[PDB]
Design a protein around this ligand. Structure first.
Ligand SMILES: O=C1CCCCCNC(=O)CCCCCN1
Length: 482
């Protein structure tokens, strides 16, 4: 069984009869057992559940395995740590299935296990104290990005053809860029993170559930599976007229495309190789007939909003520490979490109701400034997913002694460059996808990001499909896989 086939092809091999559900599953489990030890991607294997669901699985993807991030969404009866030391020791297990999980099972997917993440998803690298660092299949001494680093690495190493993750500042797109896979943060309100309400209304709407895959068609199919308004969902996205798996092949025509190949904020230089990858993709779109120009939302030249976002994040983590404490029946202390997280507890205590409300308003205002660019006639923005070369393991984790006065550790220097080009779209809520189109001169994947207007995943997946055909990446594989 060639596990390098995408989810759609793997589903067909089972439907066709070529392969059995047990063969694919067992072939996948064996692969996981052999390769995962080297990357520490899957932290909680669920082979037994995967085996039970496989026998009962039914639908367009019956028998196809997938991985779930151990954050936000939960699976009934399974361990849930959110990479919190105090929670891992408690042996806590969730009592229900998140809507996302139910939707996947009904589609025929089998829950193979959970993937690693930094504590409560508070970093753009995946090196939690609780589970250890997740390493890059392309280079074991390198980070896999974060916070959905385990899912990104898992898919890159073929531990599964698709996986789940979430994105509040680029947590799906970043790991995708760094690990050479496709990562989509859909329009705000596209995918339900319920029935639970976590992270203070999902970080005031900035946190989106996202998807990982190696093909654009797999992403389109996944959207058809997990999208839609569910009871209690705060946000909602515009409805598509046709299923995404069908519209992906439609010709969008010549679109107004703007390309960004420098850091508009001017507080650091965009890595030349990252810029060249985006430029190359822009050239391919021009060759395809689009109206490509050097242009971008002027709002991107401002990152003042990040200060306001950080304040909201302080409150969200603080209350999340509280929520997890309740799950086990006892308050969590400075000894149950990482020092970076505990520091936010104190900061949260100094945030007033009026201040919190003002910060949220600042996000809405910024979102408006950003979206006005599309309002003015532009259809898509092309830009690098990340702005720097991939960091080495350990590089982004700051020593407890370190003094990062006032702001999120992920929003400073080395970490800032990982999320500077992704976070603006968590604020605007626009659909944004990272495609594994580039490679660094030293063999590390470089993602190219495409952003469409609010709710226009249809156009986004259409152009992504064109780029997939113009600059195919399927031929490239991490050294971990020989
Ligand atoms: O999007 C991410 C990674 C960036 C972390 C930014 C700080 N915000 C939070 O920790 C809120 C929790 C969102 C987790 C998603 N991770």
């Amino acid at each position: 069984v060639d596990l390098w086939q995408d989810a759609t092809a793997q589903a067909e091999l089972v439907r066709s009869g070529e392969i059995s559900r047990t063969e694919l599953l067992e072939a996948t489990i064996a692969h996981v057992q052999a390769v995962n030890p080297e990357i520490n991607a899957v932290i909680i294997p669920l082979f037994e559940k995967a085996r039970r669901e496989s026998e009962l699985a039914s639908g367009p993807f019956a028998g196809v395995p997938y991985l779930l991030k151990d954050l936000t969404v939960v699976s009934q009866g399974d361990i849930n740590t959110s990479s919190i030391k105090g929670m891992k020791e408690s042996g806590y297990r969730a009592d229900h299935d998140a809507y996302f999980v139910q939707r996947m099972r009904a589609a025929g997917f089998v829950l193979l296990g959970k993937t690693n993440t930094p504590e409560m998803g508070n970093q753009v690298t995946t090196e939690p104290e609780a589970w250890g660092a997740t390493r890059n299949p392309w280079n074991l001494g390198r980070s896999v990005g974060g916070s959905s680093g385990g899912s990104g690495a898992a898919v890159a190493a073929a531990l599964s053809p698709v996986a789940h993750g979430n994105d509040a500042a680029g947590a799906v797109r970043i790991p995708a860029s760094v690990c050479g896979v496709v990562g989509l943060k859909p329009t705000r309100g596209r995918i339900s993170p319920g029935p639970l309400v976590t992270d203070s209304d999902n970080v005031a709407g900035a946190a989106h559930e996202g998807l990982f895959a190696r093909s654009v068609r797999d992403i389109a199919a996944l959207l058809d599976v997990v999208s839609g308004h569910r009871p209690g969902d705060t946000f909602c996205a515009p409805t598509a007229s046709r299923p995404y798996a069908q519209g992906i092949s439609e010709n969008p025509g010549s679109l107004r495309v703007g390309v960004l190949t420098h850091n508009p904020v001017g507080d650091f230089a965009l890595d030349p190789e990252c810029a060249a990858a985006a430029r190359g993709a822009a050239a391919a779109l021009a060759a395809l007939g689009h109206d490509v120009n050097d242009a971008y939302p002027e709002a991107l030249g401002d990152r003042s909003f990040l200060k306001d976002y950080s304040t909201i994040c302080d409150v969200a983590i603080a209350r999340e520490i509280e929520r997890n404490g309740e799950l086990i029946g006892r308050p969590l202390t400075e000894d149950d979490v990482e020092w970076t997280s505990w520091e936010m507890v104190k900061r949260a205590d100094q945030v007033t109701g009026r201040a919190f409300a003002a910060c949220v308003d600042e996000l809405r205002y910024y979102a408006g400034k950003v979206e006005r660019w599309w309002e003015a006639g532009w259809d898509l923005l092309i830009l690098p997913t990340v702005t720097r070369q991939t960091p080495e393991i350990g590089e982004l984790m700051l020593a407890k002694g370190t003094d990062l006065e006032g702001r999120q550790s992920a929003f400073i220097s080395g970490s800032l460059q990982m999320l500077a080009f992704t976070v603006p779209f968590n604020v605007s809520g626009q659909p944004a996808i990272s495609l594994p189109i580039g490679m660094s001169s030293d063999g590390m994947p470089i993602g190219v990001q495409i952003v469409a207007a609010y709710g226009r995943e249809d156009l986004l997946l259409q152009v992504a499909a064109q780029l997939e055909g113009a600059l195919p990446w399927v031929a490239r594989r991490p050294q971990l896989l020989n």
